[PDB]
Every structure is written in structure tokens, then in C-alpha cells.
Design a protein around this ligand. Structure first.
Ligand code: RX5
Ligand code: NAG
Ligand code: CL
Ligand code: CL
Ligand code: CL
Ligand code: CL
Length: 337
């Protein structure tokens, strides 16, 4: 096999990146987030009651309208950081890119307003391992590896900075490989800690000159479904104090005028420094000293077994094109352009 497919992604405000899949015959279209921190596929169901305002406001999958659809009906409940969704399993043909696979996915029938009323996407396509898939359902990239059509057993993410230009490419997933148009130089590869989670070892996090955090090592999940960088409550407090940031209800902020001269934050990964400047981590809506600007960094206490861990989300990926490699169990980073 030597096929590599591409899916264009929409970038909504540098916090939601999502692309299209088609389910059924004829294809029903869904906006989905490709999430390396999870491993199940789901979209909203036609059987989702109106009582779920979130079901009113998203695209629904109608089993009746698809000839390839095969019933299963087994209960499914998926819990994320954002909330819980539930429904049942269905099987059908899913297209992503030029690739068609038969897949088991969740038809969601309970979808809470918090926070799905704020999702610009309809569902999630988990790119994690079967070890994390609820119901041990075979993940879509695993069903794609099976077809043997892919040039290499890897996928990769380019996430762009949101642009006013009507033309800006919001982002791009490649199945089968990486697109040299969106990264410079060569990949630096880091080995997974273990198969089952896209998580690597991290040697420290430094803010400025001083190695402030994770001084004796810690973990980093590379999470394409995460908008921000996240660390544990106790690390983030330390980081935010170092930056003179203020915690609010939904976010952390800084005086907008102060943002540009805030220190770099570096992540020490596979012997190298991955550095994010304040231009990569502050949302500079203005530079006014009477306005507060949000940082693209927050606290998330991810529970064992996968946490405690940092998570490197779009804030980080924006800068570093990311290749997720299943064949060799490793992740490669190169400078995004
Ligand atoms: C395990 N991977 C995801 C972890 N994401 C997160 O924890 N957050 C922190 C809370 C808000 C989330 C944001 O998602 C945007 C998509 N993501 C992304 O475009 O990335 C670059 C979000 C914002 C608003 C509404 C909703 Cl439902 C979600 C991001 C699991 C996510 C995957 C998507 C469903 O929710 C679970
Ligand atoms: C649906 O999923 C359960 C999980 O494998 C399985 O036992 C069952 O055979 C499948 N249901 C049907 C109706 O085929
Ligand atoms: Cl059912
Ligand atoms: Cl889950
Ligand atoms: Cl720490
Ligand atoms: Cl940013």
C-alpha cells in the first residue's frame, strides 16, 4: 500500500479544530475532532431527543437512511474532561479522506448542554489506542491499518494560527504520512513510554532562565483534542505566579500590555528544548493596559492511570507539526510552517 490521505480542518478561534467525515451510504456528513487523547468514534443520533438542546444544534446520524448500516445497539458511555455522552453502538462505512472503512462507532442520544452547546463540531474521532477505547471497540486507525492501504502506519497534524484571511488553511491531518509543506527540517522522534497512550516522558518545564517545573521529570500526553497546554493544578499555580497571571472562572489572564515581554516557556523533550514564546501562548486581543488577555494554558488534573500528566494541546502543536507513529511507537516533532 502507498496511499496517504488528507483532511482539511477548520480552525475556530484557535480552540477548536475539526474536519469532515461521511457515515453511511449515501454519506451523512459530520464535523469531527480528531482526538489523540481518546479512542472511540461518536456522532449524535437521530434518536437523540429534542430535550437535548445540543442535539437540536448539531447534525444527527439517521440509521434508517443508510443501506450499509448494521445494527448493534450495545450501550456506550464516554466520559471526558468536558462531560459525559451516552448512546449505543452502530456499525457503518466511514470515509475519511480517500479512505473508506467499516467501523463501529457510538450513536449518541444523551449530550449535555455544558459544554456541547459550545462545540462547533458534531462528534469525535478518537485516534488513540484500543487500550483506551471504551467497550474495547476497535479504533478507526486500527481498522485503517488493517486495510493495508497506508504508505506508512503513521498520521500527523498541522494546526494553523487563526487568520482573518478567508483563505487560510485552518489545519490538516495526514493519514499515512506527513506533509513537508507544513513543517521544516527533519523530525525529532521521541519514544512512547508504552503502547496504548500517546504519552512521552518529559524532563522539565522551564519559565525564563530558571527550570521552575517538573524538575525531576513528569509526563506529557500529546493531545490533539486539547485546546491548550495543561498541567496539574499545583504546577500551573507555580507557572501562573511566575507569569504574574490571574485566575478567573474560565481562564487565566494577564494584562494585555504585559504579554509580549512575558518569559518563554520551554518543554524539555527527548533531550531538546521545545520553546513557546508569549506570542505563542497569549491571546493578544489588544495591547491595552486596561484589558485582560487570556493565556492558552490551564490546569487539568488528569486522573490515574493516564495522569498525573501534562497535556500538550493545540497551543503546542501550532508550533510543532506532530507525527504520531504506530509502527515504531513514537511521536515526531518538527517546526511547523
Ligand atoms: C482527551 N482529548 C480531549 C481533551 N480536551 C480537553 O480536555 N479540552 C478542555 C475542555 C474544552 C475542550 C474543547 O475541545 C475542543 C476540541 N479540541 C480541540 O480542537 O483541540 C485542539 C471544547 C470546547 C468547547 C466545547 C467542547 Cl464539547 C469542547 C478541550 C477530549 C475532548 C474532545 C472533544 C470533546 O470534549 C472532550
Ligand atoms: C454488537 O456488539 C456486541 C459486542 O461485540 C456483540 O456481542 C454483538 O454480537 C453485536 N450485536 C449484534 C446484534 O450483532
Ligand atoms: Cl437502540
Ligand atoms: Cl473515555
Ligand atoms: Cl512541578
Ligand atoms: Cl496563540
Amino acid at each position: 500500500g502507498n496511499t496517504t490521505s488528507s483532511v482539511i480542518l477548520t480552525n475556530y478561534m484557535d480552540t477548536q479544530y475539526y474536519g469532515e467525515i461521511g457515515i453511511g451510504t449515501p454519506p451523512q456528513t459530520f464535523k469531527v475532532v480528531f482526538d489523540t487523547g481518546s479512542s472511540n468514534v461518536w456522532v449524535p443520533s437521530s434518536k437523540c431527543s429534542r430535550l437535548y438542546t445540543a442535539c437540536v444544534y448539531h447534525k444527527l446520524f439517521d440509521a434508517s437512511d443508510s443501506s450499509s448500516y448494521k445494527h448493534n445497539g450495545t450501550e456506550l458511555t464516554l466520559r471526558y474532561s468536558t462531560g459525559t455522552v451516552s448512546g449505543f453502538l452502530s456499525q457503518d462505512i466511514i470515509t475519511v479522506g480517500g479512505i473508506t472503512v467499516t467501523q463501529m462507532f457510538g450513536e449518541v442520544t444523551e449530550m449535555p448542554a455544558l459544554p456541547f452547546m459550545l462545540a462547533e463540531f458534531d462528534g469525535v474521532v478518537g485516534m488513540g489506542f484500543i487500550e483506551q477505547a471504551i467497550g474495547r471497540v476497535t479504533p478507526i486507525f486500527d481498522n485503517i491499518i488493517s486495510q493495508g492501504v497506508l504508505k506508512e502506519d503513521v498520521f500527523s497534524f498541522y494546526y494553523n494560527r487563526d487568520s482573518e484571511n478567508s483563505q487560510s488553511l485552518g489545519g490538516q491531518i495526514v493519514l499515512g504520512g506527513s506533509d513537508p509543506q507544513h513543517y521544516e527540517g527533519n523530525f525529532h522522534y521521541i519514544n512512547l513510554i508504552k503502547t496504548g497512550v500517546w504519552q512521552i516522558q518529559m524532563k522539565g518545564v522551564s519559565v525564563g532562565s530558571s527550570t521552575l517545573l517538573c524538575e525531576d521529570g513528569c509526563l506529557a500526553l500529546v493531545d490533539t483534542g486539547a485546546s491548550y497546554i495543561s498541567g496539574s493544578t499545583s504546577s500551573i499555580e507555580k507557572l501562573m505566579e511566575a507569569l504574574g497571571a490571574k485566575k478567573r472562572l474560565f481562564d487565566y489572564v494577564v494584562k494585555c500590555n504585559e504579554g509580549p515581554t512575558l518569559p518563554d516557556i520551554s518543554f524539555h523533550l527527548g533531550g531538546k528544548e521545545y520553546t513557546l514564546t508569549s506570542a505563542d501562548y497569549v491571546f493578544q486581543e489588544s495591547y491595552s493596559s486596561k484589558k485582560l488577555c487570556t493565556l492558552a494554558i490551564h490546569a487539568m488534573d488528569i486522573p490515574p492511570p493516564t495522569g498525573p500528566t501534562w497535556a500538550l494541546g493545540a497551543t503546542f502543536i501550532r508550533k510543532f507539526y506532530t507525527e504520531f507513529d504506530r509502527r515504531n511507537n513514537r511521536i515526531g516533532f518538527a517546526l511547523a510552517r
